[PDB]
Ligand binder design. Structure first.
Ligand SMILES: CCCCCCCCCCC=O
Ligand SMILES: CCCCCCCCCCC=O
Lengths: 159, 155
């Protein structure tokens, strides 16, 4: 017998995520305009399908693009996904607060690059949303006159 | 296992805006001066102040703004930004900030806004784990980009 099945419950982890650090064996890949200079926006874990959907922004030729990539868990435990080539990636450490992964990318030229990354979750608690809503009610503000900044078609550019 | 000491200044660092509500919708609509995307906050216990670092789009262009708020003996804060402001922190932890602000603009108009902000905490253990992983893969520290500081210092 090899290893045994892993009880996986990461659904709890879906939500807003941000990129802290991304390291690379090939710096050109992460330098400005690089394909893996990805600013995470959201992550969605599905335990039924055993998938991870990545939502992130990347600048391509002085222009910002919002990308969506779906990764699928393999019986190996790793995940594979198509983005600027082929990737096999591995969650080395994941918790409600963080995420450290190792990705191996093979581009359209067969060039292999190993990347490392630290990502953090933007945790918005219920106890706090309530407190903000109450206050907002008290001050007589209308829910319609409130702007959601954690998801809007008009935000700042990291560069 | 291990947690840093609790300090006000220790809450200093990257913060992000979640929601902001207003009595005058024009203040937080596109191009409104209060449609502020927080980048960082620095609490200073000695001077009794809070420094706001945020971004706001004006005349179609994103601008980086810094505002120094000063605590009052009564615990609230004053700050000059698009008129005079009297800021009140209704709840604050290492995780969140809920606050009420009253702004009177240069023309004497009064707007009351509410806001919910959240902090981006990057824990030591996770940082070291990223670097350990990074050196295990033979990646040189000079070959790593700090995305968080870029986000905190856009343009
Ligand atoms: C790269 C962003 C998402 C699509 C490609 C598969 C791996 C991403 C993991 C993050 C990069 O280290
Ligand atoms: C409103 C100004 C008073 C102090 C800080 C103002 C800038 C951010 C708006 C605060 C809302 O909570």
């Amino acid at each position: 017998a090899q290893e045994e099945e892993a009880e996986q419950n990461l659904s709890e982890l879906s939500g807003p995520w941000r990129t802290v650090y991304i390291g690379s064996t090939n710096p050109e890949k992460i330098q400005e305009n690089g394909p893996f200079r990805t600013y995470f926006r959201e992550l969605v874990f599905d335990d039924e399908k055993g998938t991870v959907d990545f939502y992130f922004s990347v600048k391509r030729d002085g222009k910002w693009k919002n990308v969506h990539v779906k990764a699928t868990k393999q019986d190996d435990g790793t995940y594979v996904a198509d983005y600027e080539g082929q990737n096999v990636f591995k969650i080395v450490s994941l918790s409600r607060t963080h995420l450290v992964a190792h990705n191996i990318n093979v581009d359209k030229h067969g060039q292999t690059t190993e990347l490392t990354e630290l990502f953090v979750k933007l945790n918005v608690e219920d106890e706090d949303l309530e407190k903000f809503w109450k206050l907002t009610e008290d001050k007589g503000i209308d829910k319609k006159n409130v702007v959601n900044f954690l998801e809007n078609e008009n935000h700042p550019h990291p560069e």
